[model samples]
Structures are given as structure tokens and as C-alpha cells.
Target chain A: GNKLFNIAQRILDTNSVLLTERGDHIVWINNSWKFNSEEPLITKLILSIRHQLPKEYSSELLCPRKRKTVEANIRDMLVDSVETDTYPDKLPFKNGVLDLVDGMFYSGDDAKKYTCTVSTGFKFDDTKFVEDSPEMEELMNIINDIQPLTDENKKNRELYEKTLSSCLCGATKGCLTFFFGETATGKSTTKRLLKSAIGDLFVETGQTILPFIANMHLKRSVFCRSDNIKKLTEPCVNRNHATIIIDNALMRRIAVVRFRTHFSYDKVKLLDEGLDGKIQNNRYRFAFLYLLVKWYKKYHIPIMKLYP
Target chain B: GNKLFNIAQRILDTNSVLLTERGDHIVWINNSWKFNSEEPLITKLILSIRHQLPKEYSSELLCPRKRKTVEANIRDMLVDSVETDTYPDKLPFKNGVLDLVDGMFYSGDDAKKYTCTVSTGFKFDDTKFVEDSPEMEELMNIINDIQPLTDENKKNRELYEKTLSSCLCGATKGCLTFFFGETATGKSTTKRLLKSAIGDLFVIANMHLKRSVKKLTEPCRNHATIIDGKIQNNRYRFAFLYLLVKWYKKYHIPIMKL
Candidate 1:
């Protein structure tokens, strides 16, 4: 054991362990004594340490990433975008917000958020939560807003509007829809918000797969969303199909509520508590939530046969 | 595309994909194309098709795992064992027990659970939870037990009793402990019970890893702390894991990544 640790002590400098977009594992830094991406883990450790000197550092000492790459990486990090950082271990995403490190929603159509005095079959008298929360009160109005996108400029206007509506027949069966767009379109932000609007019973573990999605059968969450979730962990699902088989047809049936939309409440201020009971990160955390919407309420196609 | 599905279509007969000792993804068995051994996903579809085959076909087509191996696998399946199983999506352990598929506990000094009508500055008024939920009651009794294992009969009596205590200075500051044993020593059961005893403020995800264990800092039940949780999704790394501890501590909702 000490043998392996001692080797790590040899390579990578202890101070500068970092994450890069060329991200695989730690390797190929600009300057270092030894590096064999294929070596035993210990070898990589000792070799990487070759660079961690106390001072007199320079760009020559290591590789540099692109500006855009670094920004995206940082955003992902802040968002706990890694597949493993999931629920209960989740970062702070309020109940009604479209959150992101570098993504924002542009609602093609104004989104909606109404109060549900109750979601259950009975009412246990939670009148306090009845109308709207003080947070919701402040965001209810739209301000100095730009005009909605024009048919002449933004395409897919119809799809956005269509995506928000549901068919009476398809309502009981679930829907799974995803969106694709450029860097700022907020594909993740919009869908995440809309899915929340769709149901309160959901588990959000972004981009990572859960082995027992089927186990929730005893007490099902109305919706299960994996925002900015990784493609690797999710199987045979670029878009579609299910059967109560683990996560198989599970996604389709339980509702794969996908994203893309707008956020009128783009900013907010708060006097949050700090480490010692003081007001701290009180800065605008930018929860661009409220008025967000989804693009579908269709039923999942449980393709009994392989080809869907 | 369909080429693959078409081949699967042409395979043996029987259906039914279930979990077993010899676990894996999709497989094909004898003539009718049903499978045994163990199961998973694509395998699920074939299984729901259990609406499909016949039984009496001896354990021929597909292979059967050995008695010893199955027992080991099942035992592993039960305990918070193999690094562990995810919560809710748990293995069948038996209702009378935690339903771990296989199950445990012994309080080194005959644990006493009285009407915590008060338990050291705490009025859990939960006297009901204080003994005989039928569940804990069975496990609650040690029976008209022994006259202390003599210098001869049992081997490591002191080892177990001593193991229950702490390292004095170590107790004030916390000390992490890990265990090693052959099957069914109930290491998980004991630690689980102890963690429950140590602090009531904890989230019992068992095989789960919460993103914000630290987030539970406030609105917490006093001494709510972490016990062991499996980061099963994580694998094959030392530095990365140690790095994980640091990351967890840093963004650490409230605690350790381990």
C-alpha cells in the first residue's frame, strides 16, 4: 500500500489537481517526468506529481484549455453535472425554477405556474401553501420583456406550442420527449422546469442511470427526470420505448418529460444564511424559473417488438 | 437494426428473464430459447413474455449455478453485502427481517430498550417505537442465554466485547471503522444498529449515496450523522476516491463522500 502511495507522491504535484474538458482521467499535461496513460494507476500518480512545485509556475509548465471549454466545464461543475452527484446529494434547485450554470430558457410561449391547493385525493388543510409562496408572488409578473419570437426569425414556433399541449387519450399514458439545441438555447433548463410543472412526484438525478427505476413500482413517482444526465449510463434510449424492465420501457411509460422553453423570472435577490448565521452568498443565484413549460404529454410507446 | 432483433427472434423457445446467482445481461437457453441463470434488462422484455413457455424441461438448456456459489451469491445479495444493493430496488430478504434476502444483531452488553418515556435528555414519547413493533421484538430478545463463554468453549469473546468500545481519545473525535469477516457474521447488521443507536438523525438510503448529505445540516434531528453508504456507481479508483472525499468535503452538502 505505501508502495503505491509513495509513487503517487512522486508524479503529480499535490496542489494542482484539476478537471479539464479533454477530460478522461489525469494525463497528458504539458510538462511532467513520466506518463503512460496505460500504466498501472500508481505510475500515473507518480508521473503527474512531477509538476507540483511550490512556485515559479508558467504556461509552459502545463497545458491550457480553450476559453469556451473552461467556461462550460466550470458551469457543469457548479451544477453538479457529473453523473454521480444526484438527489439527496443534489445542489440547491428550488421547487419552481429553471436552473443552470450557463443555460437559460427563452419561452417560445409564456409558461405557466398555478397553485395546486392539493395534489392528493384528500385535503389535510395546508392552507398556508394554498395560493402562492412569497417567492412566487415576486416572480408572477413579467417585466420589460422582449417580444415573443417571430415566425420570421425563430423556427419551430409551432413545435413549441404543440409541445405544451396534451391529448385527452394520451394523458394517462406517459410521454418522454427531449430537445436539442445550441449552447444557449437552454435545452436542459426548460425541460427540467416543465417536468417539475408536470408533476411533484419525481426524482431528479441528472444524467445518471438508477439501477432500480423499476423498484419504484410499489410507490411510483409521477415523473422521473435526468437533467443534463450523461448519455453513457442511459441504455438503448436516445429517444423511446419501455417495459417494466428496470429502466427499459420504464422511461417511456412513466413519462420521459423532455425540455426547451422560456423564463420570465430571470433574476431574484435574497439574504441567505451563511456559515456562521450571517447573510452570505446573498448574491442573485439566478434561478430563472417560473412560467416554464414542456413540449409534450404523449404516451410512451411500449414497443413489444424490438423495432419502434 | 432489425438484424439483431431478427436473430433474437430466431433463437430458442421458452421465455422469462429473472435474477439468479449467475447474473448477467440477455442470454439464450435450450430449444425454446428461454433463459435461466440470472437476468437484467433486455432480459426483462423476454421475461414479461413469461406469458410464453414450459417448465418440466429439466435444468438442461441454460446452465445452473452450483449450490455453494448460489449460496454465496444469495448471501452477498442479502447483506448490505457486496459493496451493496440500491434502496427500494432491494433484494427479497423476508418481511420478518429487513428483507435483505439474508439477514442480524447483538449489543455487546445486552442492549436495553425501555420506555424512553425518556432516553437521556430526549422524550421520544415514542414509547410505542420503544420495543415490540413485533419486528424488533423478535430480534430484541437474546433468549435465556449463556453463562459467559468459558476460557474454553468459545474463541474470541473478549475480541467482540472490546471491539464494541472505543479508543478513548478516539471517541471524542470520530474514528472510522471498517469490517472483515466470512459470510453471515452480521457486520452490516451490527453497524447499522449501532449507527441507529449512535444518532437518530440520519437518512437510511443503505445502498444509496445522496448528493447533499451535508444539506441535511439544519432541520436535522440533533445528532443526525452519516453511517456507511455505498457509492456502488463508483468503481476502480484510489486517488479518484480520495479525491472524492475532498470534493464531498468541499461542496460537501454536509459530510463525507465515503
Candidate 2:
């Protein structure tokens, strides 16, 4: 019983949950799915999640209430999940959502229209974790619980301990918290721990080129790759010095609000001699104006003429 | 509360459990007694255990609870703890124990000679375990539970998972087992998970050099102490095998396999 719910909670805990055109799809960042053309394995995955945890919500989501229902009860005893509250920011099971493309959510009506349930592969759940003693967490506790060799021990461990065991939401402004230690000092597991806690919010990877950076799938991911980029170039060049000159070409691209200590869009400029910063106003206004016009007509309005 | 019972239990789990001793002490492997020069930490450790837990007996030897009450309770729990046995071999905690030196049991007569109560170092308990969404235990489970992409996954993981998670008493002829793996493939964390489930039993360390084979200890008012490495040598080249010969030569100090 506990096993059933354990896997269910584990599924949600380790992977990024996507309430996609499909009901709820759980995908992996650290792993890639073996796509199936004829019988999509993804369907099996959804079943694995749904069936693994339902009533008690652990093993079989479509639990045969007679036998499996009780198993789920114990399986689910350990979790406290909720339904509803499904929105872009809080997409039910997802750690966080993809930095959306355009035009709001794929409404339920649209999802139902496009939704064709696909099997999610196989009976798979995320990895499992068990901390006994001397692991990071317990190690921290022992250090805390022990009678210090000298009062000095406490002072020494305070920051490292706090960072290691306590906060990941950058309990400290979180500007690239670094961790490099002797082999297996858990430098890697620390990230694994973070991923376990925050799911896809903490994606880790290895060396790669620009594609990874520009990947659409990873827009919402905090991608971490090893042995990678060393510099961040700025100040675009012109025809006199070009990033790419199709017969002397040029380029242009581009905010914390006030109290937002905020302003900078790196409107980088090119300088290839004879470079022209042919630019244009490229920002768009909220479509909410049309909606707002209707909203004003719906009842209330500001005392001034806002938009037509 | 279960918390206290748990620490008493963890103390035993994290150490080599010996119901013997000039004092029935429960010291650790990967961890050791600060053995005070003037005031023996052993006494405190012994008291820590005596005060922790006790049953009618530590299995067979009707462990005189009155003498070693706390230690008895702590020791007993470590031996019989069956709380949702986390995984395969890991449920058992420990890396290794120094092959113990020997001594006769502390007879009631000698109890008076070296019996002076000393303060244990301080307040302590096993660190707690929290297996929520993705704590340690569940992670190990999912790894094992997944369907093997190929029959090869089965053939490869069967033993490692078995030893790491299922059987600490070496379900296979009760021999020592070891683990290692690719970086994020979770080899280390698996061991970390194992260590967490049964710690100090599994410190991540290096290949050793060499009497790591011999050298035992004999302390006061306890069992009779003998240096005696009656066994071991090049016969056991494997460090792990050496560790075993070192231990088996000394023995299963206390506790249960069944």
C-alpha cells in the first residue's frame, strides 16, 4: 500500500509534471523518453502515474477499489497533494511552467479537441531515495546534535550547513551558489538533492554548444551544463567589425522597474564600419485593451478616458 | 516517544553492537569513542545505551537490564528494527568494525571493581529520516522499481540493488558486498542512500594500503582483552575479503541475522 503511493508521490516529486493536451503528462529532464510511433509509451507512463496513485493514490489510479483501493490508501498516506489550482504558474503537478509562447493557456476546450491519449511508455516511476545515517541530512544533524569539540565547530558549520541542508531558493539571494569539493563530497548529489526537492527547476547537464542554450524545450528550465561557456560577449560590432556581414551588415536587439533597481535591455549595437543601426519600435501592447474595453462596459470604469 | 526509541535504535545501527564488554559499550565504526584519558567516554557510551532501550533479553543472553538497561534497549532495537525495512541489503547499517580483541564476560564479581558512573559526552540521537516526495528512501525504490530497458538492465542491477537495498546479512552466503557507479547514474547516491539507511556502514572512501588487518583492543573491567590476530594475512588479498577475515576472525560481536 505504502509502496503504491510512494511511487505516485515519487512520480510527481522527481519529474516535471505537464498538464498538457493530454490529461497530465510527466516528463524527465535528466532522461529522454524512448518515443513509440505505433503505441506511444507515454500513455503507459500516464497510466503508471494515474494507476499507481488514486484513491489512496499510489499504485493503481484506476484502482480496482476492492483489492487495490486499500493499497493506495497506505501508499498515499505519506503524501498531501491537491487538485485544482491549475494555472500557468501553478500547473497542478509541474515544478514550474514553460515560459509560455503566446495566446494564454491551451484551454480545456482546445486540449480536448487535440487530445488523443497516448501511452507513456512503460510502468515507470522516478528514482527512489532513502537516507539512513552519515548522508548529507543526517550528517548535518549529527554535527548539530553532537557536543561540539569546541564552540568553534558551530560557527564553522553555520553557513555551509545552512546552505547545504537548509535553503535552495537561494536563501541567500541565490546568485550562483557554488559547490566544488573533493571527489564525491556530494558536489553532484547536492544538485541531485536540489532537483529532488525542486524537480525541473534544477536541471543539470554536460558540455554542449549554443543549441542547448537556445532550445525551446528548456526555456523554462534553469539549464546547467558542465565544461561550457567561459565568456559573455557584449557590444555588438558593425561593418568595420562584423558578427555576420552580408555585404556590410549591422544588427540590433533588445527591466526591473523603479524600486525594481531596474533598467537595461542590452540594446546591443553593431559597429562594422559603415554599420547602420536600422532599428524599429518592436514592443507590443496588451490585447487586454480590447478585453478591458469590454470589461469597462461590463460595469465599472476609471473616471478618465483610458483607451478607445 | 518513538524518537527516543529511534536514537537508541540508531546508535546500535550505526555501531558494532557488542553485548559484551567490560561495559556493553555501543561505539561506532566510521565514528569512534573520544575515549577520554581521565574519564572514559566508553562509560558514557555504555550508559547512553543502557538508558536507551532494553527487552527481557538482547535475543538469548538475558541481558541483565538492571546493569545495562539503557544500552540494552538501544542495542535491542538496532538488532530487531523492522520499520518498513527500507530496501534490499541496506536496511543494515555499517561500513566495518575493527576485528575485536577478546576477553571473558564481565562476571558479577568484577562488576564492583571498575564500576563508577561517568557523564556521557552529551545529548544525542540518530538523525531523523524524512521520506516525503523525494527524500532518500523513495528515490532508491523508484530506481529499483523501474522496468529494465533491456534484459541487460536486469542482469546488471540484480546484485548491486540486492546488496545495496535488500540483504545486509548477505542473503548470499552472508558475505561482504561493495558498491560503485557512474557519476549521476546515482551510484554514489545509492550508497549514500544505503549509508543513510544504515550509516557509517558505508562511508565513501578509498582503497587502503595495509593490519587494517590486525591490531585489536583490550580494555578494563570488560571482557578479557587479547591482541591475538589468530588469523588473516595475504590469504585474504581483497581488502574487502581482508576486512572480512579481520572481522570473522574476531566475529559477529552481537545482534541478529535472522
Candidate 3:
């Protein structure tokens, strides 16, 4: 028993593990660890530590009493020291900022000490500005056609861009952006573009925010956009870190961008020339989204000067 | 132009990129390379090569003619050399089997050469025997209660396990397993477990097999299970590479395993 305890202690001391800041889940960076028990990862770690011990040692670790003792001891040793740090977008360290992709880490500088949990599944690829990508140009044309380049339209576009930029950059306190227009005037397309960029963080709730609140929480999502949200009674439990988008309307800190097109949507469809599928296939539109985020970030102001 | 071209060549040579087997998309394992134009990853690679040059180079890489030549040059150089091998499940290398975890690689052996593209998003975290996990045990109990331990029932269970195992192991030609029991007898629970295990590859289409066939194709899904399918007349175009789970029925080369 003493030999087994000592061996387990040695194994625990050698391997570094992190408990989530909330202390709910344990995170092991590498994959060599074997877990025989279906207990939480922490318990698994403890069991695996005991399993790795030499066969001459006792298997007292299997008993509930010894297992609890070992688990509490390990937690006491590392709870304050090795808790994980989670960030929504970027983590600013001493030397540089670490950006999180969907499943990978991207940092231009030295970033070895940190293990980050990227909640959203977004991966930012290079998006160079192209003045004329056929599919992307059509999307831009659709938006512009809905709101032509007059001063009022340009002003509306600016507000729209600022609102979207604020929301996309992990801002929760700002007013929810609403792009209200007649159906098929590039509203769905615009929604799809933002959805693609946000990856899995963007949740499309059906017409109401009541049923999807639990789902949104499950996703740990920052943005929740619903079409035609009727009632305003559902408690948004995650308002501190949640950005809501309403398609039909909103009264709770909402900015409405109304679309007015010179021509009918049928003509817009005629003009589309099957560019929708091209956008869907990831031909050149993701690069366009990169450009969109870049431009939005360039002109983004933290506080809203005006909301229409 | 020469210095810039040389710089571009150096960048291309320094960075190892893989072209998909179909040669449609270029995959870069790392994320440092910057592209200044809204081109495909390959074109972006070429343009970024030119962009990283000293300021004196002619931006002739932007011109259509030089751009095509550079693209063709890169394609010719890498046409037969660097191509990606996409496997639905495991990859058998010389040393050992390489199993894939979603967004990560889980290999006990040395796997530094592989930059894997895990299509499905399934992380097979230790699903240890867990004989008594309340939620999981409930599932097991449901399945058992539905098909209790009679001789015929035991035979059916064995066949069920074998059929599901074969399909889950990426076998496309196996019999389509159907659980035509009472409505509340854990068929739905069984489906959910398999769906959860399969991750994004499991497609739940409508009652018929027509409309979802295109969607199934788009997902590159190995397994397509539809509930209460009224018709099978839609040509199973991907039968060679597709394993189908029919909730209602199938007579088209199906083993009717369960």
C-alpha cells in the first residue's frame, strides 16, 4: 500500500494537468494518458496514475477511500496553480497576443506556456482585398442595389457596418444589430456570410429566443440571432457575454438597418447568375468575409454615435 | 522582379503545402503565411510569395499572364509530388494504425509527417466500459428491455451488433440494419447513440430518400439513415461508397440484418 501510494504520488507529480477555472472539467494537453474508469477526467487521471505504477505495488487506489484521498490531494496541490485561462477572442500575454482558431492556436510570437480553449469554431484565413471577385462582387452588388450609394444609404451602411463590427468583435454590451428588409433582398445571404465567419458561435433560433436559450448556453455562444422574435419576455441568462440579433425587430437596445431597393428582388435574382452556390462552395467568399471583417475593424468605434 | 521572384520561390520552397488528392484546394498545416489578394489558397500562396519580396520588385505577379504562369509552374512542380490522402476512418501506416480525433490527431506512434484533415467532428474521449453510468446505463437498459435475452432475441442482438459494427467500421456494402419493433422500444435511442458517435456524417433526412440524396452527397457522408422512408426509387448513386440505414425498408441488395 505504501509503495502504491508513493508511486501514485510520483506519477501525479510528474504530469501537469489543469483544472478549468470553474473547476468542473480537467484538461490534459496530450493524448498518451489512458483512462480505465468513466469518472470525470480528474478521476481518470488519478486512476491512470495508479494504473501506471509497477505491479509489485498494491492496488489500493481502486478503493473509494484511497481514491478520494488521492483526488483531493491532487486538487489541493494544483487547483490554484494550474487553472486554465479561457478568452473569447484573443489572449494578450506579456510578449504578444494569442489568437484562437477553431481547433488550433495561431500566434506570431512565442506562445508555448499557454493552452487556450477556443469556444467558437472560427478559423481566420488570409483575406486579401480583391476589387472584383465574381461571386463576392455580386453579394456586394446585391447589398448596394438594395441601398444605393446616396448619402442616406451610405450613412445607413456605415451604421450597419459599425453595429455588425461591434457584435462580431465579442462585444456584448452594445445594441443588437437588426438588418430589416423585404425577404430575399440579400438578407439571408448576409446572414449566411456572418454565420460562416462566426462559425458555430452564431446560432439561428427560430422566430423566438425562448426555446434556444438553453441551446445557446450549451454552445457557449457569444451571438444569438433569431428571425421574427415576437415576445420580449424570455430571460436572456447570458446577457453579460451574449450578443443578440433580431431579424424582424427588437426594442431592447436594437439598431435597425432598413433596406430599400430600386429594383424588385426578382430582378436581383435574375442578376444573381447562380452566384449563391459559388458562395456556398467556399470558392472566394470566405476571403471576402476576411476583407469584410478587416474593413469593419478599421472603422469600428467602441461606442455607437448613432443608431437607426 | 527577379529578387521578388526569388523571394517568392524561397517562400514556396520553405513552406510545405499539400494539394488535395482531387487537386481542388491547397492545405497549409500552419497559419503564418499572409495573402494580400482574394485568391484561392494556392494563388494566395503565389501572391504572398511575391508580396513578401523586397519593395523593388515589379508587381508583375498581379498581371494575369505572369500569374497564370506562376500557377502552372507551381502545379507542375507539385502535381505528382505533394498530394493529400483523405481516409474516412483510420490510416494504416508502416509502424501502426493512425486514428483521428476531430480537429486533432491521436496517434501513439510518431505522426509528425501527417497534417491530417479530420472531416467529421468526433472526439472519442474515453468512453470507458462505464457499466453503470446513470444516463448511459439507461440507454443500455432500454436496448436490452426492447430485445430481451431469449434465444431468438439473442441471435437478433448478435446480428444487430455485427451489422452495426460493420457499418460503423466504414463498410458500405453491408446489409442495411432495420429495427422494426414497437414504437417506444429504444430504436430512437439506438439511433441517437450511433448519430452521436458518427458526429456530422450521420444525416437525418425526411420520410423519403429523394431530396436528401443530394444533401447526403454534399456531406460526403458514409452513413445515411432516414426514418420511415416511403420510397427507395431514388437512385442510390453513391452505393459504391455509401452505407445506408433505412428506417422503413430496403430490398435493393440489402441483407435486412435485424
Candidate 4:
């Protein structure tokens, strides 16, 4: 009826024992012993530490039991020896078998004597192993795996790939371009056109005065020269990040410039560093059009030369 | 030639002479002596003050034609003695002809002497002044001088009106309401909805932690709650501005409570 007898017999057949004898003293080591039961020996040691030891010793020993089984067991053993009067209340030392023995016998050398094993069974390079072996194919048969792609799913996958590819390809190394103009000057319209051409790229529109300050903190080489540049650049001198686009550079300049000179040495230094790094290694590209002026100038150019 | 004669006659008609006799001493006041040419008599007095006066008396007596006219024509005659050596370079005095004439004889003072009368001029405040007057008719003529409105012009005007109305109604207030959400929780979509509803309104979609800290300072003082009573029967604190929409009530809580 009980499986323990058969398990012990099987263990004795398969397990190897080493006996070390030195001057009539013999130490027995069982090589295949494992501790795989639900009520593991380490847990029993923790319970004994809590009940049998003094309050101070119990707390001290229990402290190490949190994510540390070996230290707690040793502390419990020391406390248990000190409480000798309480020891005979429960057992002859054999009956009080070291409950923490399971934790002590974790290593390959110590496992040789343990009856239960608690290996996590985790393996390194699991993905590689699955790929290399036929186990993945076997797993597919055991699990209800759907391999066919629906039309919608296929479309979504294609769109995701296309969008990702566009983002990767369209994003130039360190270039930040800004278009700015008065209201109705088509800065937003042009940005939309650029986004359309690039396919699925994000075109930030209708930005406020605050983002420029954030961009300044980001400390990218490319920056939008706007009135809010000072506020934006104030936070960016220490940070070195990506280029920032100012949606309406003209509006920012008109609104924020009279308050302070945004183009300061600190900001310029940050920009120069970013620019120098980019120039040295083709890292960042920064460009912005004061669409208010640039667009007017472009519009006035002769029709024949407009394309150029 | 006839027009020239007519002008000469008009000048004479406006002129008059004065004569005085003091026991066989006949004196003709120089009123009738009008200069047909435009050269005024004051010019002759200045020439005499400049060239004819001796050095000692020249600075005092021969000042300029303006003062010389006052002294020669008015003051010397009032003294009743010819002070020839006193101001030898000054012009001989003329009495009532040039000095102390009646106030009515002055050109600008007496409108009756030089009236700008015209026939058929309508009186102001008459109904006919507005209905039939030439000036009012001219204004009415220009009333129809209006340019036709283009589609773009009409659209722009409509947009401006809508923006003004929305501003007055506080529709675009707290446009950044949508941005106060957890990351990747459709904050951008909410911002888009706000932008579409209130065209050209700025909604800050994404803000870094540092910038967000700065924005905390911008909320109005009235954003705080006012707790009036204490304990169980006390009223809860609330913002001064009440919610216009159910969505707004759901989204916003009083800053003090928050």
C-alpha cells in the first residue's frame, strides 16, 4: 500500500554508498539519495526553530530562513543544542533527526546521501536546445497549436513589418527637422505629406511651448530654434539624446523670445557637442525651416526655378 | 480784360476815404491810398529801418518793420508831435487808416463783411438733408461698393467666429485633460479627439517628467477646494468652475481633494 518501501529498495539497488573508515570510525555516504517529498526537511527545521528556541534565538534563526535555508538551519541547530532541556521533551537525537539535512545536501557531493532531490530542472540555452532537437515538433503535437494565418492576421503582420521597416529606414541617424510658420502656412500639411511618403511614421502636430523645454533636457544635437528654445534648452544641457522637432518654430520664437535669450552658452555648448559628434562620425542631422520666412521666400522664387 | 476790371472795381467798392480839417489845416487820412499791386506798406517801413537810420538810434528805433509799424503809425500820432529825428528811418504815420479802426472793419472778426453765402444750401437736421442732401447722397452711392465673398473667405470667417465663440464658452479650457493618464493608455487618441473638437487648440500629448513638474505651477488658484464646514455635516470642497459635460465631471476632480 505504501510506496516508501519500494522507493527505498529501489534507491538501495541503484544508489552507491561510500564508507570512510579512519581508526574504527566509519562515515556512510549514500550517493543516489534525494529529498523530493512535499514536506521537505528544510521546512521542518524552520518550524522547529520557531517552536523550540528562545524568542531572541528564534527570531534570529527565522530571519535567515527567508530566501536562505542553509543559514537558518545552522542557526536553528545551534539554538536547539542550547535548549537541551526541551530536546528530550521531543526525542532521542535519532528521532530529532536533523530536519535541515535536505538543504545541506543540495550539492552533488551532499546529494550522494540525501533521499529526496529538489532540482529546478531548469536548463541553459533552452531555446537553442529546442531548436536543435525534435522536441519542439513533439510539443506541437501535444499542444493545440494554430499554424494557419487568417487574411486579417496576415494583413496586420504585413502592416507591422512595413511600419517597423519604415521607421528603421526613414529615421536618419541624428537628424531633427522642424517646420515652422504662421497659422495656415501649411507647415502641418507638409509634415503630413512627409509622413505619408514615409508610410506609418509619426508626425507630431500641434505641439505646445512645453515640449521644447523637454527636448532641451533630452540634449539632442538637432533642435528647433524657437522662442521657447530657452525654456526647452534649460533642462537639456546635461542630457544627450535625440533630435527634437518643433512643430511651429515661428510661433515659439514670437511668443517666447522677448522673455529671455534662449541661445545661451550652455545650450550652444550642448548643441555644439552634439553637432561635433555627428560631424565627426555622421551621427546626427538637425534641420528646421522657419516656414514663415522660408515659405514666403520660396513662394517668391520664379516658377521655373521653384522645383530646384 | 473784363474780369481784371471787375476785380479792380470790387476792391475799390470795399475801400473808403476819411478827411479832417483843423481851422484851414486839411489832413487826408490815407485810407483811399490803396496799393493796386500786392506789395504791402509794411515792406516800405522795414526798408527805411534797415538802410536810412543812423548808428546810435538804429538799434533802438529801427528794430524791424513789425515794431516799426506799431510805433510809426499808432504811437507817434497819439503823441500829436512829429518826432522825425526820434525815428528818422520810420515811415510817416497814418491815423485811422492803419491804426485803431473799428472792430467791424476787420476781415475775420465781422463775417458780414466777407460772407461765404451760397443759394440752395440745405439746413442741417432737416429730413430732406439726409434724404436729398448732396453729401448724404454721396455716402449712399458708395454703400453698394462691396466685394463678393469667396468660399475660402467665408470658411475663414466661420472658423474665426467658431474660435471666438468656443473661447467665450470655455470649450477649449483644460485641453490637456486627456494627457493625464497612464502610459500607452490612449492618451494620444484623447488628445486627437480634443484637437478635432476644438480646431487649432494645443493639447500637449506627451510630456517628460521634468516638464510635467513645471506645468504643476500653472493651474489657477481657484483650482483649490473650499471646505466651508467641519465634521459630519460639513460640505465637501469643490472647484469654483463647475462641470459643463458629464464626461468632464467624470474626468476632473477638485485639485485639493486630488
Which candidate number would show the highest lDDT if scored against the true structure?
3
Report the C-alpha lDDT of model 1 over A224-292, residue by residue, as the tens digit: 344322221222221111121114433433322222333322223232123112112211112212222
Accuracy of chain B in candidate 3 (TM-score)? 0.46
State in Å the error of residue B62, model 2: 28
| Tens digits of lDDT, candidate 3, A98-152 | 3423222344323323443323343334333344555566556655665566775
Error of 2 at B134 (Å): 12
Which of 1 and 2 is the better model by TM-score?
2
Q: lDDT of each structure?
A: 0.25, 0.27, 0.42, 0.24
Better of 1 and 2 by lDDT: 2
Best of the candidates, DockQ = 1
DockQ of each: 0.01, 0.01, 0.01, 0.00
Q: Which window of ten consecutive residues has the lowest lDDT sum in model 2 chain B? A: B224-233
Model 4: residue A299 alpha-carbon error in angstroms = 32
TM-score each candidate: 0.19, 0.21, 0.37, 0.13
Please tell me which model should have the higher DockQ, number 1 or number 2: 1
Q: Model 2 Cα displacement at A80 (Å)?
A: 32
Candidate 3 lDDT tens digits, B140-175? 454567658678677776666445433322222323
Question: Can you write out model 2's per-residue Cα lDDT over A200-256, one digit (the tens) per residue?
Answer: 323344434314332212111232321121111111110000010000101111000
